[PDB]
Amino acid sequence: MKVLFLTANEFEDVELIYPYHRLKEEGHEVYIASFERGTITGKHGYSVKVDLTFDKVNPEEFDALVLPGGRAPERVRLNEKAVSIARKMFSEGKPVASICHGPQILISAGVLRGRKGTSYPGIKDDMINAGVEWVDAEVVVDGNWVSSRVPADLYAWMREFVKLLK
Amino acid sequence: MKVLFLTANEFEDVELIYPYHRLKEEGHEVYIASFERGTITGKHGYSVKVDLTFDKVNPEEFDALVLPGGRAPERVRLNEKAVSIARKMFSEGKPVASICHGPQILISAGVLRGRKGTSYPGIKDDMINAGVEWVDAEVVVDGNWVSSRVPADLYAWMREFVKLLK
Amino acid sequence: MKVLFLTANEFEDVELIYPYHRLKEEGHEVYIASFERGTITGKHGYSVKVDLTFDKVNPEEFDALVLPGGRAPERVRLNEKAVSIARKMFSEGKPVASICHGPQILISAGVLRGRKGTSYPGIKDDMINAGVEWVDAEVVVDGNWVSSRVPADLYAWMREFVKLLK
Amino acid sequence: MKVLFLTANEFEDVELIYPYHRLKEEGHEVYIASFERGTITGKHGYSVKVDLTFDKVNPEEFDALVLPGGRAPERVRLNEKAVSIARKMFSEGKPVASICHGPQILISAGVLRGRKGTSYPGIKDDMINAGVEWVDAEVVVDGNWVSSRVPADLYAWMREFVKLLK
Amino acid sequence: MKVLFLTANEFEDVELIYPYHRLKEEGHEVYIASFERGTITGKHGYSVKVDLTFDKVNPEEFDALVLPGGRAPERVRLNEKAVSIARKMFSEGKPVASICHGPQILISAGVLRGRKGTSYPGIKDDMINAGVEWVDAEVVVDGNWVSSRVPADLYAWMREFVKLLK
Amino acid sequence: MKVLFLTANEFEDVELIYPYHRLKEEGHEVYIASFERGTITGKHGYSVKVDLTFDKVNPEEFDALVLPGGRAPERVRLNEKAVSIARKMFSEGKPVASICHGPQILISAGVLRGRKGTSYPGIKDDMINAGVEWVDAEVVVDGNWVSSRVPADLYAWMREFVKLLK
Ligand SMILES: [Tb+3]
Ligand SMILES: [Tb+3]
Ligand SMILES: [Tb+3]
Ligand SMILES: [Tb+3]
Ligand SMILES: [Tb+3]
Secondary structure (H helix, E strand, O other), X not given: OEEEEEOOOOEOHHHHHHHHHXXXXXXXXXXXXXXXXXXXXXXXXXXXXXXXXHHHOOHHHOOEEEEOOEOHHHHHOOOHHHHHHHHHHHHOOOOEEEEOOOOHHHXXXXXXXXXXXXXXXXXXXXXXXXXOEEOOOOOEEEOOEEEEOOHHHHHHHHHHHHHHHO | OXXXXXXXXXXXXXXXXXXXXXXXXXXXXXXXXXOOOEEEEOOOOOEXXXXXXXXXXXXXXXXXXXXXXXXXXXXXXXXXXXXHHHHHHHHOOOOEEEEOOOOHHHXXXXXXXXOEEOOOHHHHHHHHHXXXXXXXXXXXXXXXXXXXXXXXXXXXXXXXXXXXXX | OEEEEEOOOOEOHHHHHHHHHHHHHOOOEEEEEEOOOEEEEOOOOOEXXXXXXXXXXXXXXXXXXXXXXXXXXXXXXXXHHHHXXXXXXXXXXXXXXXXXXXXXXXXXXXXXXXXEEOOOHHHHHHHHHOOOXXXXXXXXXXXXXXXXXXXXXXXXXXXXXXXXXX | OEXXXXXOOOEOHHHHHHHHXXXXXXXXXXXXXXXXXXXXXXXXXXXXXXXXXXXXXXXXXXXXXXXXXXXXXXXXXXXXXXXXXXXXXXXXXXXXXXXXXXXXXXXXXXXOOOOEEXXXXXXXXXXXXXXXXEOOOOOEEEOOEEEEOOHHHHHHHHHHXXXXXX | OEEEEEOOOOEOHHHHHHHHHHHHHOOOEEEEXXXXXXXXXXXXXXXXXXXXXXXXXOHXXXXXXXXXXXXXXXXXXXXXXXXXXXHHHHHOXXXXXXXXXXXXXXXXXXXXXXXXXXXXXXXXXXXXXOOOEEOOOOOEEEOOEEEEOOHHHHHHHHHHHHHHHO | OEEEEEOOOOEOHHHHHHHHHHHHHOOOEEEEEEOOOEEEEOOOOOEEEEOEEHHHOOHHHOOEEEEOOEOOHHHHOOOXXXXXXXXXXXXXXXXXXXXXXXXXXXXXXXXXXXXXXXXXXXXXXXXXHOOOEXXXXXXXXXXXXXXXXXXXXXXXXXXXXXXXXX
């Protein structure tokens, strides 16, 4: 399956790199989308190559979406095209993986009312104000939406997401 | 007046240091409250001494509140006592200045329904979901609440706040 | 009034940013002059846009001068044109504010013999050798010259300087 | 299976964190051993809790071994006890995963002469002088020894190691 | 004499800067060779100008060779041209000074079998597997090869090397 | 000969480490004096062990003095005891080496009037106001006083200083 990552500079490094390799292990094709072509750099200094820009993404051409955390979601969520990609893929029922600040993009997409999930605890009140039934758990699976809180949850996060992709 | 600051490590340096000196110029007494006693350090490496801990704060002892930005508000907003201080002071109509990510504390206090103000634009959707009429302006004055977005707004932010303390 | 700042890379961030916003609050027009156009970066990583170069400054066009600290004054003081600007404005009796290492530029201008003021204590012997009557105080006002020592003095420094620009 | 990691400060962050979560997804119990029982920090600044010291490790109590890279192996490989653990576990035919500089520990254990594998290319001549048949491949499986070169190989590295732990 | 330095980014700063100045004191001409022209930066942030690239070195026109440490030798040792410079100069009996990880270049040149020297202790097993009679001493002089371990040995390292160039 | 170094935190790393090793090469005993015992850290992060405090220094017990640069001299020179050590050793005609900001300590000692030397060019005017005949040269030898400007001058600085210690 073709898996799309929506991210930007100051992504939480392991929250991108871990699902990237975990999904490649399964044989899935992984694509990193950001504002511009070239490279992006994580909070801790890992550099990743951008495969395509948000403007060049056709969400019809992707089967699943991953939203890492860090400070990147606060910039991604102000990009109308990035938010539209997340809005369309999530509302169509495609698998969507979010961790940490990742679901700020889903908040901006307006797709979380009545949905059950988790996030970085520091934004739980924003999740609740967006209509989420917020849970303090290492992983939540609510239909197509697999959500986790922090890097310590990575093992459980992708354990559940990988099931959704097969 | 006695002005309280609710903050923590990874505060945006100038958003704390600027109002601190600006209100000292007026002869106001300025107090930095945080989790623990000792020093806190900004994103850019400035160190400031903590005057008292959140547990030791009596909100009735303080006349006004400043909420700087940075990553600090996401840690402050998970502290029940800090959120209670902001809840009490804001709902009593005492002057409250927020800038950047500062109003995340006010979101968690549940006091912004029907209010008008601004923030860091990256969290405008969270402000809107908290019931704020969000404005893209360098400074907004809504009764007791003076709000600004970023460090470039500092001059206008405290220009309006000092007016409420005199 | 039109207020000129003579500075360069490795300026002490708050010593430039604080008076910049404080004087904008009053409605003064603030201009940052440096070696080259573009931007300069402080010791702590804050970036500020340069409005004009030393070579394009006509001191007659400006009403007041601010000399922040950091390691920038040791670069500025070797620029003949920057030193000439400070020499002319100071000797004409225009308001001049200095803090920390800022007065090293005034030492190189040859205008401090017989004047009273302060600076970072680490350079008090250089101030004294230039003929300054050095005082250990948070702010000194000697006619047109307002001087302070360290960032902890910011509130008193601009409290006195703002009075001269009225 | 109980999986032991031999590491230290300045480990390559993703080379430790990735297999840690990947093996944890399978339900394996993962243990981090180092010089002292507190916290170790990677080259990029991620912190991980040390479960036990090398002195407290009984290799008989562990089923498999992971050797991440970074600058850490050059410290670990000078510890008699750490090298002894790797020597026993490898010579007993237990599964051993190494990546990047990790096999420097196995070079010091004297167990690689006649074996086939890979490493960070920068140390291929050391691997060859240790008697390794060095291969430029993303992953090599030589009986119990699964070896990879760099972080880009993570997906293939643990794809093969997990298969050996089934 | 003309002295050549083979180095790259992430050189150990003092291990390059110390012999560079120490040999200039004697009147020797010092040349820094690396991958590209411009500047290289040490682990601690000192910047050094590159005089020539590896491809433009003729080893017949240099009398001596210095191999500093840091992470740079692991990059240099994968450059065929850099390795053949070291191979030719060392086997011709020209004076060669190495410290710390510096001799990794000599390992890759295949010139150390039967020779006596030292290095960073972390790579002593690689030196031994290359056929070195490894010694734990602050400086070793083995004919044309002067070797030291760590920055604390700088004084003894160049004390011996300077004798070979007089 | 016994050589004393007067320094502190934020010393310029190579300006301390270079003469330290260079004088040890000659067989001189080198002592690092600072405010407190333990370690000091340079601008670029090198750590050095303090041998004695300024309070336990008896200047009769030392034959020569080295004053490295960095931001350390501005701290040292406010210490009455450290300045007294430099005053006594310099006025007794003992060899004194200074580089960069190093001579700020000699300015505070009041011993430079009518002397000839150099320094970091950023403090030329302070040297001149102290009564120095300032020269723009890589090294100046004025009887017992050997002075240089910047790290690029290290080779010439100690080339001349070493000659005074016979
Ligand atoms: Tb951007
Ligand atoms: Tb904390
Ligand atoms: Tb074979
Ligand atoms: Tb296979
Ligand atoms: Tb020549």
